[PDB]
A paper describes a structure:
Myocilin has no known function, and there is no glaucoma phenotype in Myoc knockout mice or in individuals with a homozygous N-terminal truncation mutation or hemizygous deletion of MYOC, but rare non-synonymous coding mutations lead to toxic intracellular sequestration of misfolded myocilin.
Assessment of spent media from cells expressing each of the 16 full-length myocilin variants revealed WT-like secretion for T256M, R296H, L303I, S313F, V329M, S331L, T353I, A445V, V449I and K500R. No gross changes from WT OLF were detected for the structures of T293K, R296H, L303I, V329M, S331L, E352K, T353I, K398R, A445V, V449I or K500R, indicating that these mutations are accommodated within the native five-bladed β-propeller fold and do not perturb the dinuclear calcium-containing site. In addition to the five variants that we predicted initially to be benign (T293K, T353I, K398R, A445V and K500R), our study reveals seven more (T256M, R296H, L303I, V329M, S331L, E352K and V499I) that are indistinguishable from WT OLF across multiple assays. Thus, our data indicate these should also be considered benign.
Residue numbers in the entry: 244 to 502
Write the structure that this text describes.
Amino acid sequence: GCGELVWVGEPLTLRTAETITGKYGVWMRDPKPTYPYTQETTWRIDTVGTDVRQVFEYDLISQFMQGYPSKVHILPRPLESTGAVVYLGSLYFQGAESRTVIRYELNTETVKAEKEIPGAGYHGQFPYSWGGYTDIDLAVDEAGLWVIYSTDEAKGAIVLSKLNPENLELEQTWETNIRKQSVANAFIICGTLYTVSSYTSADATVNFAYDTGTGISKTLTIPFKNRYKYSSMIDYNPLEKKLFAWDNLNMVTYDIKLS
Ligand SMILES: [Ca+2]
Ligand code: NA
């Protein structure tokens, strides 16, 4: 049931990192679980530092919330920032100190594709407002896989592109009028891009929207609470119909409502 975001719920804390290594990170479930994973399988990456390669994998939600991983993957090259996503059994992440997106098949621990995002800024050119090298932000919605970034030609404004999940080819790109470094993070619900206004305020908002299906740029004032005052990662999961976020060592989730 597609529609426009009209409400976000309170953040619920599901797991809390115990070390500075997890002050920021990314955690995710696959909207299209493929064998041997299911809808419960959760991945977790603590992303503080310059040699991030451990992907924590949990078979059951109970294990994500309590206990050790079922499995740890060692990525063949360090991962950059908090923007990665899992889709169709592959982890999609950005090579550190590069503009390359890498497709890592989880069940075989094999790199299946690599692709430079043409013209994309990286490593502090067009981060989100908190920095953290967040130049390139992958996304999964109801129609598939996207990447959110900017370029010199776009002059810091958010660009978004549909991505072929098999070979990482860019299927179509849109250009917004939202300065990327002026928002705390971004996500896509039903082909519409949403931005969050601040990463520190307990009274932030979802403040912009750009509908790729009609080209309309829009302004909103939907309350969004950063319960722990440092949201480093905010994504949308079209299967659970919920936002997944990482807020100052805390892995939280947000209920939503669409019109
Ligand atoms: Ca995001
Ligand atoms: Na992302």
